[PDB]
Design a protein around this ligand. Structure first.
Ligand SMILES: Cc1ccc(-n2nc(C(C)(C)C)cc2NC(=O)Nc2nc(CCOCc3cccnc3)cs2)cc1
Ligand SMILES: CCCCCCCCO[C@@H]1O[C@H](CO)[C@@H](O)[C@H](O)[C@H]1O
Length: 337
């Protein structure tokens, strides 16, 4: 049976939700979009309901709506955001204009956990382990996050962590993304992890650049200027010439940057924050690293089913994206509680 819906004025608009979702009230001010906290009476969970803004206004909007819904429907891992529900008040394709996404209500992101303070080594181990476990899964589906940072990491009271993407902001970006490289390795995400880890250990931003060029300046100070093997890999003549014109600075001693840190943590950081992306440790390799001895379990670090990114990259008409999105809404099956 189709659930009974009720209507209510929220965020300047008329929301229409199934009655299982009780006591809607706006959260985040507006920083997560049009979102209300709610209580799901069916499951006994506090949830967040997001009303997608203008989902089918343009081809780009329609495409984004379909890409996010399809992707979130595919994500089924403890350390990655999942969808609790998705619904529309519409009874048919003809009147289909709104899409609501339902997730767990999240009380905190990683910054709310850190508060610019050092964490214990055991706590760092646990948090980084979970990020890497979630990344192994995401990367196995051939997906690159590309914007991993503390505000994209949800963390509950028992420090259980989920990777999401809400869509300063450059502090965790891989140098090759800063340089508009275009053939990104999955290890761009590993760079971000190294930056996050370093901050958890020290309670300070590793590379707090003031602007774009400063960010790169700070990075090079730690990891040194490119060696000969890396110089060989630069197709760009201008990039090649400029780096050749630079003054050679050696890699810093990480042990003398993270003073008093677990030497296993120092070792891992050295393997994450390598300028040459081809030489960075992968998510799977990082999980097997000794730093995570107390958490690593080879039999419970699952991979994803294959994910088709070509379907979302098509050039389709607005009503085609809308119909395909509608199908995704209708075929949705909630997770086992
Ligand atoms: C176009 C596009 C496509 C794919 C993505 N991706 N890619 C990923 C992964 C690659 C899987 C990481 C994840 C997303 N998307 C994603 O996380 N979306 C979210 N939507 C909400 C609902 C609103 O916040 C609720 C709330 C707010 C405050 C408190 N408590 C709850 C949460 S997380 C993004 C954009
Ligand atoms: C002056 C700053 C130099 C930064 C150089 C960053 C090099 C990143 O590393 C590069 O990543 C590319 C994109 O995935 C790969 O194609 C290359 O093989 C790899 O060497």
């Amino acid at each position: 049976e189709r659930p009974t819906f009720y209507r209510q004025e929220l965020n300047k608009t008329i929301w229409e939700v199934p009655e299982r979702y009780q006591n809607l009230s706006p959260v985040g001010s507006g920083a997560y979009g049009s979102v209300c906290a709610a209580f799901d009476t069916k499951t006994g969970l506090r949830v967040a309901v997001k009303k997608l803004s203008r989902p089918f206004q343009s081809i780009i909007h329609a495409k984004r709506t379909y890409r996010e819904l399809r992707l979130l429907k595919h994500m089924k891992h403890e350390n990655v955001i999942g969808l609790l529900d998705v619904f529309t008040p519409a009874r048919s394709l003809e009147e289909f204009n709104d899409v609501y996404l339902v997730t767990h209500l999240m009380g905190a992101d990683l910054n709310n956990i850190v508060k610019s303070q050092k964490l214990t080594d055991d706590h760092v181990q646990f948090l980084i382990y979970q990020i890497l476990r979630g990344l192994k899964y995401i990367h196995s589906a051939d997906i690159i996050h590309r914007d991993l940072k503390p505000s994209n990491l949800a963390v509950n009271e028992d420090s259980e962590l989920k990777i999401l993407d809400f869509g300063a902001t450059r502090w965790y970006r891989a140098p090759e993304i800063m340089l508009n490289w275009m053939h990104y390795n999955q290890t761009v995400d590993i760079w971000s992890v190294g930056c996050i880890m370093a901050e958890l250990l020290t309670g300070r931003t590793l590379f707090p650049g003031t602007d774009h060029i400063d960010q790169l300046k700070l990075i090079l100070r730690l990891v040194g200027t490119p060696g000969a093997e890396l110089l060989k890999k630069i197709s760009s003549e201008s990039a090649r010439n400029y780096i050749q014109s630079l003054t050679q600075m050696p890699k810093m001693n990480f042990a003398n940057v993270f003073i008093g840190a677990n030497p296993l943590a120092v070792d891992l950081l050295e393997k994450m924050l390598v300028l040459d992306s081809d030489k960075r440790i992968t998510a799977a390799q990082a999980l097997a690293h000794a730093y995570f001895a107390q958490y690593h379990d080879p039999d419970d670090e699952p991979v994803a089913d294959p994910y088709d990114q070509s379907l979302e990259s098509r050039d389709l008409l607005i009503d085609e994206w809308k119909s395909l999105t509608y199908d995704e809404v209708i075929s949705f099956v909630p997770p086992p509680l």
